[PDB]
Chains A and B, each alone.
Chain A
Amino acid sequence: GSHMMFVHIADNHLGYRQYNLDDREKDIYDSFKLCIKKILEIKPDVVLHSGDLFNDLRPPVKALRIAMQAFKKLHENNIKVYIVAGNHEMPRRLGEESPLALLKDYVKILDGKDVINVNGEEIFICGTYYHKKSKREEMLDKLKNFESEAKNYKKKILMLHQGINPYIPLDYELEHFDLPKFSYYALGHIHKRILERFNDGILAYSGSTEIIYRNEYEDYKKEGKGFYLVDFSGNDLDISDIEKIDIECREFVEVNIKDKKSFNEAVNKIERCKNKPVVFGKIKREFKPWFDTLKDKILINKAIIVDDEFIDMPDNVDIESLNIKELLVDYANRQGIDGDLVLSLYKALLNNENWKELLDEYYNTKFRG
C-alpha cells in the first residue's frame, strides 16, 4: 500500500545541432528518446519537467514531432507531466506561442498553483517560467502566493527554471534565501547535476540530457547525465529516497598533443572509447598530419592546431589593469628621472596648473645637479 513516485527531468534542448553536425543533432534526440523510454518503463506516477525541452522558440518540425510523440505516450500510459517553460521557450513577441503549446493535451504548463492526488494523499505543486533578472522582483511576489497558498499542505514541490546564487556563481536571477520552504525543488537551467539538502527538503537540478558544451564532459563522468527518480513515499525525503537514472552520451576527449609521449596518450583515449568521440583541445602543428590518420576513429576534431613557435599557457590568468600612474613612474626611473616628479609635472600640466612653481620648487628643493 501507499506508493507514489515521480521522475524529475530537465534541459533536453531538443533540436540543438552542435558544431553544425547532423550527428550531434541525432545524439540529442536519441538521449531524449532514451529518457522517455526508461521513464515509460518506470511508469512513474508523475513527471516533473523543469524546462528547456526545446532549444529555440521556433524549433524544427522534427524536434517538435519527436516531442509530441514522446509526450503522447507519457499521457497515453496515464502519466501526469508538469512543465515550466525555460528561457528558450518563452515567446518574446506575444501573439506568437511558445512551442510548449504544441504539447498542451499531454502536459500541464505551470504558472500557478495545483494539487495532485496520489494514494488519496494530497500533494501541492507550484512553478513558473523563466524570468529575466530584470523582472526578478515581480517574481518574489509569485513565490509569496506560492508560499502562502502552500502553507496549508504537508508535502509541497517547487518548479522553476531560473539560476540561483550559490549554485551558478556567475549568471543568476535568484538567490538562495530568495525562496520559501518546500519539500523538493525541481530545477532547470544548470546543466551539471545538482542534488542537496536545503530548507528541510531536497533541492535538485536534473541537469541537461546530453553534453551541450565541451566543459560538461568532465562534469559528466563524475556525476552522469540523465534524470531524477524520486520516491516520495514516507513523510519526509533525504538524498536517500532520490534515485538517479543515468544515460550515455556522445564522448568527448581532450587531447593536448605536445610530444611523442602525448600523441600516444591521445591514441590511448580515442580507441579506448565507446563510440566515435568528439576530440578537442590543443595539438602542436608537427603532429597534425599524423592525427588526420585517425580521421575515421574520430567524429569531429575541434582541437586547435597550435603553431610550433608558441610553447606556453595562453589561457593563463594574468589580471592586468595597467595603472597608468604606477607605470609612468616605474618607467621614468628606469631612465634616471624623478618619476615621483615627472608624474606630478604631468597631473599639473593637464589641470592647467602653475608649472613654474612645481619646477621652481623641485629646482631649489630636491634638484641636486
Chain B
Amino acid sequence: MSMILKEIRMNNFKSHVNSRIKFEKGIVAIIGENGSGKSSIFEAVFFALFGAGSNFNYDTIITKGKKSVYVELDFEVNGNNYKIIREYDSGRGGAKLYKNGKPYATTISAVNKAVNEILGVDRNMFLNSIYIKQGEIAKFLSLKPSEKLETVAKLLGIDEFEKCYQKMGEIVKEYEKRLERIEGELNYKRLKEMSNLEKEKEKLTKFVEYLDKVRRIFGRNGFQAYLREKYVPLIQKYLNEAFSEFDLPYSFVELTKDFEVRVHAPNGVLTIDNLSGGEQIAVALSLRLAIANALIGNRVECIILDEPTVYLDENRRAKLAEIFRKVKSIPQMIIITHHRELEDVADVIINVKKDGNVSKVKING
C-alpha cells in the first residue's frame, strides 16, 4: 500500500474558488494565517477519493457563491499513476477514474468500490491512518480497546487473516460433504481388516481434522493473536525511541497487549488520562510514527497531519520538528501548521494566503 499524492486541482471548493497545487515529496508543509485555506486542500483530497457518501449537504464544500464543484487529484499508488475526478452541478454529480490513461470505473458507484481496493482501507480506516484531521491527533488512544484492536488489526495486515479464517471455514465445508458422501456409500459397511473405502473414509476424516486445525491457526484466538503479540514489543521500541526525544520526565513507555499506553513515572504508572494536553499529543504523535516504522517495508504510504503541534509548547514543537526530520519510514509527510518551527525544517513550504474570502496557493521551497 505505497501511496503518494502528485498534485491536485480544485474548483468552487469552499475558499478555494480555483487553484492547483503541486505535491513534492518529503517534508511537504502547508502554512498560513487563520482560515487561509489549509485544511480544505485536504478536505478536497479526501473528497476526490471517497466522495461524501450519503446525499449529504453539498452546500458545505461548494464556495458559498457558486453552484458547481470540481476536484481532480493526481497520485502515484503502488507504483502506478492514477487520477480521480468528482463533480456536482446543482443537484447531481458523478465520478470518473483514469488508470495511466485507461479508466477502470466510470460511475459514482463504480469508481467507489474501485477506490477501496486500490488503497485497501475504507473511508474510516483512511482517517485512522493516512489522513489525521485537525483535532484528532490523539483520537486513536481515545478509543475503546476493542475499537483499537479493530483499527490496528487492519493497519497491520491481520484483517486479511480473518478472511483466511472464514475462508477455511467454507473450505472445511467441501471436504465434509465429500466425507458425508463417502459415509453414505459405506452405509452397510476378528479376521476382518479394513476395506479400501474404509481406508479412504478414515484418511478423508483425518484430513478434515488437519483442515480445521489450520482454520484455527487463522483464528482470533490463534495466529492473529501471535502476530499481534510478536508486534507490540517492536512498536514499543519505536514509540520510546521517539518519545524520549521530547525530554519528558519518564522512564520508558509500556505498550500493552491491547495497545494501551502506560507511562512509567518514577513512583507509578500514568495513563493517557493523567497526561496533560501537550503530553497526550506527544505520545499520540510518537505512537503513530512508531507503528509507521514497525511496518517499515510491509506497507510504505504517505501521511497527512493537520496541526500536529497542537497544545505543544515552544520546547516541544521544535523537539517534534527534529523528530519529523529524522523520520524515515514515510516518503510523503505533508504537514499543516501555522507554526514557525516546522517551517524552517521543510523541503517544501507551500504558502496559503486568503484574499478577501478567496484563497490562493503560492508553492515555494
Which A residues form the contact surface with B (CB < 8 A)? 19-20, 57, 92-93, 132, 134-135, 285, 288, 302, 304-307, 314, 318, 320-322, 324, 327-328, 331-332, 335-337, 342, 345-346, 349-350, 355-356, 359, 363, 367, 369
Chain B, residues 282-297, CB within 8 Å of chain A (1/0): the string is 0000000000000011
Asked if A369 and B234 make an inter-chain contact with CB atoms under 8 angstroms apart, the answer reads no
Q: Name 13 interchain pairs, CB-CB below 8 A, sorted by A.
A: A134-B365, A135-B365, A285-B267, A304-B251, A322-B227, A322-B231, A322-B234, A327-B227, A332-B217, A345-B168, A346-B164, A367-B207, A369-B207
Q: Cα distance A350–B161 when bound, in Å?
A: 9
- A337 CB contacts on chain B under 8 angstroms: 210, 213-214, 217
Query: 20 additional contacts, CB 8 Å, given A321-B297, A349-B168?
Result: A57-B344, A132-B347, A134-B26, A134-B347, A285-B267, A288-B266, A322-B230, A322-B234, A327-B230, A331-B217, A335-B213, A336-B213, A337-B217, A342-B217, A345-B168, A350-B164, A355-B171, A367-B210, A369-B202, A369-B209
Q: Cα distance A290–B203 when bound, in Å?
A: 71
In-complex Cβ contact of A20 among B157, B174, B251, B315 (8 A):
B315
Asked if A345 and B214 make an inter-chain contact with CB atoms under 8 angstroms apart, the answer reads yes
Q: Cα distance A342–B161 when bound, in Å?
A: 12
Asked if A331 and B315 make an inter-chain contact with CB atoms under 8 angstroms apart, the answer reads no
What number of B residues sit within 8 Å (CB to CB) of A?
44
Asked if B266 and A305 make an inter-chain contact with CB atoms under 8 angstroms apart, the answer reads yes
Q: Which residue of B lies closest to A350 (CB)?
A: B160
- A350 CB contacts on chain B under 8 angstroms: 160, 163-164
Q: Which residue of A lies closest to B344 (CB)?
A: A92
- B226 CB contacts on chain A under 8 angstroms: 327, 331
Given contacts A132-B347, A345-B214, A369-B210, contact A328 B223 (CB under 8 A): yes
In the complex, whether B100 has a CB less than 8 A from a CB of chain A is no
Given contacts A336-B213, A355-B171, A367-B207, contact A349 B163 (CB under 8 A): yes
In-complex Cβ contact of B298 among A92, A324, A328, A332 (8 A):
A324
Interface centre among A19, A302, A328 (most CB of B within 10 A): A328
Q: Which residue of B lies closest to A93 (CB)?
A: B343
- A349 CB contacts on chain B under 8 angstroms: 163-164, 167-168
In the complex, whether B246 has a CB less than 8 A from a CB of chain A is no
Q: Cα distance A302–B266 when bound, in Å?
A: 13
Given contacts A92-B349, A321-B297, A350-B164, contact A369 B251 (CB under 8 A): no
Residues 199-240 of B at the A interface (beta carbon under 8 Å) = 202-203, 206-207, 209-211, 213-214, 217, 223, 226-227, 230-231, 233-234, 237, 240
- B344 CB contacts on chain A under 8 angstroms: 57, 92
- B349 CB contacts on chain A under 8 angstroms: 92
Q: Which residue of B lies closest to A335 (CB)?
A: B217
In the complex, whether B123 has a CB less than 8 A from a CB of chain A is no
Nearest 4 CB-CB pairings of A with B: A369-B206, A305-B266, A349-B167, A92-B344
Residues 27-45 of B at the A interface (beta carbon under 8 Å) = none
In the complex, whether B360 has a CB less than 8 A from a CB of chain A is no
Nearest CB of chain B from residue A134's CB, rounded to whole Å: 5
In the complex, whether B247 has a CB less than 8 A from a CB of chain A is yes
